[PDB]
Amino acid sequence: GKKIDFLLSVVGFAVDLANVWRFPYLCYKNGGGAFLIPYTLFLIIAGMPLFYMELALGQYNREGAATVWKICPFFKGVGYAVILIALYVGFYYNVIIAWSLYYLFSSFTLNLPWTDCGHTWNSPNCTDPKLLYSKYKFTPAAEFYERGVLHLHESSGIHDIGLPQWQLLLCLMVVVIVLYFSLWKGVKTSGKVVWITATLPYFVLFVLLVHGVTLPGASNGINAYLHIDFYRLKEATVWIDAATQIFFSLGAGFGVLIAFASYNKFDNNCYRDALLTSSINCITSFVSGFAIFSILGYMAHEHKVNIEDVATEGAGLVFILYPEAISTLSGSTFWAVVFFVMLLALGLDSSMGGMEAVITGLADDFQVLKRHRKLFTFGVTFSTFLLALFCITKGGIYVLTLLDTFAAGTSILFAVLMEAIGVSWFYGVDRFSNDIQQMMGFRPGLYWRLCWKFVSPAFLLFVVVVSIINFKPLTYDDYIFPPWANWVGWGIALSSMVLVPIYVIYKFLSTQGSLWERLAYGITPENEHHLVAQRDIRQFQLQHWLAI
Ligand SMILES: Clc1ccc(-c2csc3[n+]2CCS3)cc1
Ligand SMILES: [Cl-]
Numbered sequence: 001g002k003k004i005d006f007l008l009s010v011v012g013f014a015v016d017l018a019n020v021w022r023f024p025y026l027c028y029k030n031g032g033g034a035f036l037i038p039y040t041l042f043l044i045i046a047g048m049p050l051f052y053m054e055l056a057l058g059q060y061n062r063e064g065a066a067t068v069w070k071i072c073p074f075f076k077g078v079g080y081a082v083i084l085i086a087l088y089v090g091f092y093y094n095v096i097i098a099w100s101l102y103y104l105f106s107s108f109t110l111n112l113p114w115t116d117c118g119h120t121w122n123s124p125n126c127t128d129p130k131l132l133y134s135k136y137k138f139t140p141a142a143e144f145y146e147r148g149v150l151h152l153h154e155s156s157g158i159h160d161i162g163l164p165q166w167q168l169l170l171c172l173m174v175v176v177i178v179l180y181f182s183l184w185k186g187v188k189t190s191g192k193v194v195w196i197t198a199t200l201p202y203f204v205l206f207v208l209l210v211h212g213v214t215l216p217g218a219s220n221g222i223n224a225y226l227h228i229d230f231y232r233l234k235e236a237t238v239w240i241d242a243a244t245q246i247f248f249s250l251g252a253g254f255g256v257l258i259a260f261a262s263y264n265k266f267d268n269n270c271y272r273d274a275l276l277t278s279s280i281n282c283i284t285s286f287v288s289g290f291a292i293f294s295i296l297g298y299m300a301h302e303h304k305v306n307i308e309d310v311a312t313e314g315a316g317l318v319f320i321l322y323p324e325a326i327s328t329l330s331g332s333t334f335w336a337v338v339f340f341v342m343l344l345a346l347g348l349d350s351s352m353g354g355m356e357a358v359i360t361g362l363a364d365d366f367q368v369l370k371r372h373r374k375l376f377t378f379g380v381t382f383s384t385f386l387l388a389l390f391c392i393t394k395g396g397i398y399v400l401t402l403l404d405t406f407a408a409g410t411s412i413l414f415a416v417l418m419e420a421i422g423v424s425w426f427y428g429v430d431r432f433s434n435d436i437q438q439m440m441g442f443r444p445g446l447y448w449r450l451c452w453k454f455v456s457p458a459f460l461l462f463v464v465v466v467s468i469i470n471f472k473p474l475t476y477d478d479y480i481f482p483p484w485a486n487w488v489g490w491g492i493a494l495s496s497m498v499l500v501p502i503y504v505i506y507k508f509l510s511t512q513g514s515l516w517e518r519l520a521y522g523i524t525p526e527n528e529h530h531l532v533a534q535r536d537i538r539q540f541q542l543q544h545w546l547a548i
Contacts, residue, residue, distance in 0.1 A: 009190070010273065012198035014280035016350040018249035020201065020343070021096060022404075023285050024292040025317035026241050032225035032293050034232040038242035040282065046459055047246045048278045049451035050416055052444075053423060053432070054252050055270035058261025060435045064361035065255025068262075070526040075422040077503025081415045082255040083361045084496045087380075088407035089254070090354055091387040092400045094179070097347035098171040098392065099319060102149055104340035105171075110333055114144040114323045121148035129302050135312050135477050136305055141320050141327075142312070150316075155395030158402070158485050162394035172385065172392055175348070180381040182352055184374050187263060187360065189352065197345045204342045205287055207335075212294040212325055221297015224307055225290060240467045243460075244409050249281055253408075253416035256357035269440055295321045298328075314397070314476055315404060355380060398485075401476050406489035410467045411496045417460035418500050424453040426523050426539065430547045449548055 027035045061068045066079035106113050113119060117126035117140050125138045137146060146152045155162050182189060212218055232238055247253045261270070299321070300307040311320050322339060329335045358380055363370040391399045423432055429449050437443045474481040474489060504522075511518045520532045523539050531537070538544045 005191075007276075008195065008198050010276045011202075011280055012194055013273070014277050015198070015201045015284050015346065016249065016251075017093070017096060017343075017347050018245070018350075019281065019284045019288050020205075020346060021315070021318050023245060023249065023288055024321070025313055025315065026245050027225075027289045028292065028296065028311070028317060029313040030238045030241055031227075031229045031232050032289065033227060034229045035238055035242060036286070036289070037228065037233065038239045039246060039285070042239075042243045042246045042459070043250075043278060043282055045451065046243070046416075046456045047250045047252065048274060049448055049456050050247075050252045050420065051250050051257065051278060052270060052274040052448065053420070053452055054257040055261045055264075055274055056432070056436050056439070057423065058258035059264045059266065059268060059270055060439055062262050064259045064262060064364040065357070066361045067364040068258055069422070072422050072427045072523060073526060074426070074504050074507055074522045075418060075500070076507070077500035078415055078418040078422060079255065079361065080503065081411070081496045081499040082253055082419075083358055084499065085408050085412055085415060086254040086256065086354060086357045086361075087384070088403065088492070088496070090351065090358075090384045091407075092391050092403045093347070093351055093354060094175055094384060094388050095168075095172065095391045095396070095400060096315070097175045097344065097351060098168055098388075099149065100340055100343040100347055101171040101175060102167060103319065103323075104337065104344060106149075107333065107336035107340055112323065112327060112332060112336060113148060114141040115327050116140050117143065119144075119148065123147070123153070129304075134309065136303060136310060137312070137477075139303060139320075141324050144323075145316050145319050149319075150397055151394050152397055155393070155398070157479060158395055158398040158481060160395060161399060164389050164392045165394065165396075168392040168396075169389070172388055176381055176385040176388075178348060179351060179355060180377060182348070183355060183359065183381070184377045186373070187260075187356055194349065197349045200338075200342045201346055202284075204339055205284070205291060208322070208325060209287060209291045209294070211329060212291055212298065215294065215298040215328065217298040217301025218294040219297065220300060220307060221293040221295065222290070224297065225293035236466045236470045237472070240409075240463060240470075243413060243463045247412050247416060248408055249285065250278065253412045253419070254354070254357055255361050256353055259357050259360040260353065262360070266439055267441075270436075271440065271444075292318070292321055295325045299324060312477055315400060316397070355384070398476060398479070398481070402474060402481070402485060402489050403492070405474060406492045409493060410464055411493040413460055413464045413467065414497050415500075417457060417464060420452060420457050420460065424457070425545070427525075428538070428544060428547065429453045446548075453548060 057068055061071065063070065064079075065082045066076060069076045069079050116128045116131060122140075122143050126140060126143050127138050128140055136142065149168075151165055251257055296310050297307055299310045303310060311317055323336070326332050326336045326339060359373070359377060363373065363376065369376045390396070391403065393399070423429075429452055432452070433443050433449060473483070473486055507522055508518050511521050513521065517532065520537045520540070521529060524532055524537065
C-alpha cells in the first residue's frame with residue numbers, strides 16, 4: 001500500500017483548477033497547439049527543476065517560504081513576495097469556486113438554465129439553434145453565464161463595477177466558511193476524503209473526452225488543436241502565457257511547495273515526486289485541451305460560425321463550454337450535478353493548500369501567530385473574503401481579469417528567478433547538491449544542477465524582460481480597459497516584486513559592522529555567522545562562484 005497511496009496522493013498532487021479552468025482559455029486564446037510547444041519546453045526546462053528545488057529546500061530546512069532563507073538572509077524579501085502573491089491569488093481563485101457553487105445550485109432541475117432562451121435574464125438578441133470578429137455571446141449558455149450569474153450587463157466597465165451580487169455573495173460566504181473550518185485546526189487534513197477528489201476529475205475528463213470525440217463538429221476542433229501556427233511563436237505572448245501557466249499549475253513560486261515539504265520525512269524522495277507530478281500535470285493539461293477543443297469545434301458547427309469566434313477568450317470559457325457539452329449528454333441533469341460537484345471539490349482542495357501556504361509562512365516567521373492559529377486563520381480568511389467581495393460585483397469579471405493578469409505574472413516570474421539565483425549562486429549549487437545527497441542518498445545529476453544554475457535563470461530573465469517590454473494593454477473580449485487600470489495592474493505586480501530590494505536594503509542597514517562585514521553577514525547562513533569574525537567567507541572566493 002506504500003505505492004498505491006503515494007500514487008493516489010501522487011496523482012492528486014497533480015490535478016487542480018489550473019488545468020481544468022485556466023489552461024483551456026489560455027490554449028484557446030493562443031491557438032490550440034502552438035501553445036503546447038512553449039508549454040512543454042518551459043515545463044521541462046524551468047518548471048521541473050524549480051519544483052524539484054523547492055521540494056528539496058522545504059524538506060531539508062524544515063521552514064516555510066519566509067524563514068527558509070536563514071541560509072541566505074538577503075532573500076527573505078523573496079519569501080515575503082511569494083507569500084504576498086499566494087495571498088493575491090486567493091481573492092479570485094475563491095470567486096471561481098463561488099461560480100462553481102452557483103452552477104451546482106442551478107443544476108438541480110430537469111431543465112438546465114443554459115439550454116435555451118426565454119428566461120428573465122435572456123435578452124432580445126438571444127438566439128437558440130434548436131428553436132430557430134466578435135465573440136458570440138448571444139447563445140443561451142453565454143447569455144446565462146453573463147446575465148444570470150455575473151449580471152455583467154449591468155456594468156459598463158471597471159469604472160462602474162457596482163455592488164456585489166447577492167447570490168454570488170452567499171456562495172462566496174459558503175466557500176470562505178468551508179475554507180476556514182477546513183484550515184482552523186492545522187495542516188493535517190489529507191488522507192481522509194482526498195481519495196474521491198483524486199479520481200473524480202479524471203473520470204469526468206475521460207467521459208467528456210469520449211463523448212465529445214463523437215460529436216458532429218469535433219473533428220474540426222481536433223484538427224485546429226493539432227495544427228501549429230508557427231507565426232504565433234514569434235510574438236512572445238504565447239511564451240509569456242506558457243511560462244506563467246506552467247508556474248501556476250505546477251505550484252512553484254508561491255511558497256506552497258516549500259511549506260508542505262517542510263512537513264515531509266527527511267528521507268522522502270523529492271526527485272520522484274517532482275517527476276511524477278510534472279508528467280501527470282502535462283498529460284492532464286494535454287487531455288483537457290483536447291476535450292475543450294473538441295467541444296468548441298462542435299459548437300462552431302452547431303452555431304454556424306468560425307471556430308475562432310465561437311466562445312469567449314476569458315476566464316468563463318469552461319463555464320460556457322462544459323455546460324454546452326453536458327446539454328448533449330443523456331440524463332444531463334445528473335451529469336451537470338456530477339461535474340459541478342467535481343469542480344467544487346477540486347477548487348476547495350486546491351485553495352486549502354494555497355491558503356495554508358500563507359498561514360504557515362507567516363506563522364514560521366512570528367511565533368505569536370503560531371500560538372493562535374484560529375485567530376490568524378480567521379484574519380486571513382476574512383481579508384480574502386473582503387478582497388474577493390471586490391470581485392463579485394456586477395463588473396467583477398473585469399477585476400478578476402485584471403487580477404488573473406497581474407497578480408502572478410511578471411511578479412511570479414521575478415520571484416522564481418530570485419529564488420533560483422539566491423539558492424544556486426549565493427547559497428551554492430554544490431551545497432544544495434550535498435544537502436540533497438544527505439537527505440535522499442544520491443547527488444543530483446549534472447542536468448539538474450545546470451538547469452538550477454544557468455538554464456532556468458537565463459530563460460526566466462528573458463521571459464521577465466520580454467513580458468515587461470512587450471506588454472499589451474488589458475482587454476476583455478471587445479472591452480478595452482482604461483489606462484489607469486493598466487497602471488493599477490502594474491502597481492499590483494510591483495507591490496510583490498519590490499519586496500526583495502526593499503528587504504535587501506533593510507537587512508543591510510540593520511546590520512552592524514563594516515561594508516564587507518555587512519555583506520558577509522547578509523550572504524552567510526545564520527548558523528555559521530561565527531565564521532564571519534574569522535574572515536572565512538566562501539562567497540568571497542572565485543571557487544564558490546565557478547563551482548557547478
Ligand atoms: Cl490563495 C491560493 C490558491 C491557489 C494557489 C495555487 C496555485 S498552483 C497550486 N496552488 C495551491 C496548491 S498547487 C495558491 C494560493
Ligand atoms: Cl495546465
